[PDB]
Amino acid sequence: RSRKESYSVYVYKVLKQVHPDTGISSKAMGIMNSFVNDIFERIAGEASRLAHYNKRSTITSREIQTAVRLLLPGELAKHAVSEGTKAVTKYTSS
């Protein structure tokens, strides 16, 4: 019997960090699974087109950063860019 995969484990970990005493129903967990998959494809698709316009053959963290600026509005983009930059610096230092 084939077994599938989801983001349920990781979503639950994040919830326990911002609200240590609240739970979530199974219907609401299904909605969050759809949300993560939808945003993933929007960003990956835009970064793929960026590499084609500039005649490159690699997707780097620079293409991801430009795609986030095109898709997210206003103050959401500013906060997301600083989160991504900080994670890459920490990963490289170790």
């Binding site: 990781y10 911002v18 979530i24 993933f40 590499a51 053959s57 690699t58 986030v68 989160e83 990963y91």
Partner: protein
């Protein structure tokens, strides 16, 4: 002797999985090759957006005296923001309802 294994997520200080995101990028026909920093950057952005929604939804659930989060709470969080409402402007949420709103001319004198 091989050193002890260590996840790529733990080295970046994240909760979303970096290895699984890397595999999904490779097998999605997006480009010929994928750089080493792209999965780390993408996982951090996905984790940030999840934290934003869950924080607002938890406030709505506690507002009407509930312990768990249901689809109605997620809809109230999204439509009452200004930027989240603009990012998800073409999305239907099942069992979500609508915001209460009545035009002023319809009210009795």
């Amino acid at each position: 002797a091989r050193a002890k294994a260590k996840t790529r997520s733990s080295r970046a200080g994240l909760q979303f999985p970096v290895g699984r995101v890397h595999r999904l990028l490779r097998k999605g026909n997006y480009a010929e090759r994928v750089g080493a920093g792209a999965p780390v950057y993408l996982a951090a952005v996905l984790e940030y957006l999840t934290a934003e929604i869950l924080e607002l939804a938890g406030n709505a659930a506690r507002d009407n005296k509930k312990t768990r989060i249901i689809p109605r709470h997620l809809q109230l969080a999204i439509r009452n923001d200004e930027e989240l409402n603009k990012l998800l402007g073409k999305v239907t949420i099942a069992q979500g309802g609508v915001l209460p709103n009545i035009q002023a001319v319809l009210l009795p004198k």
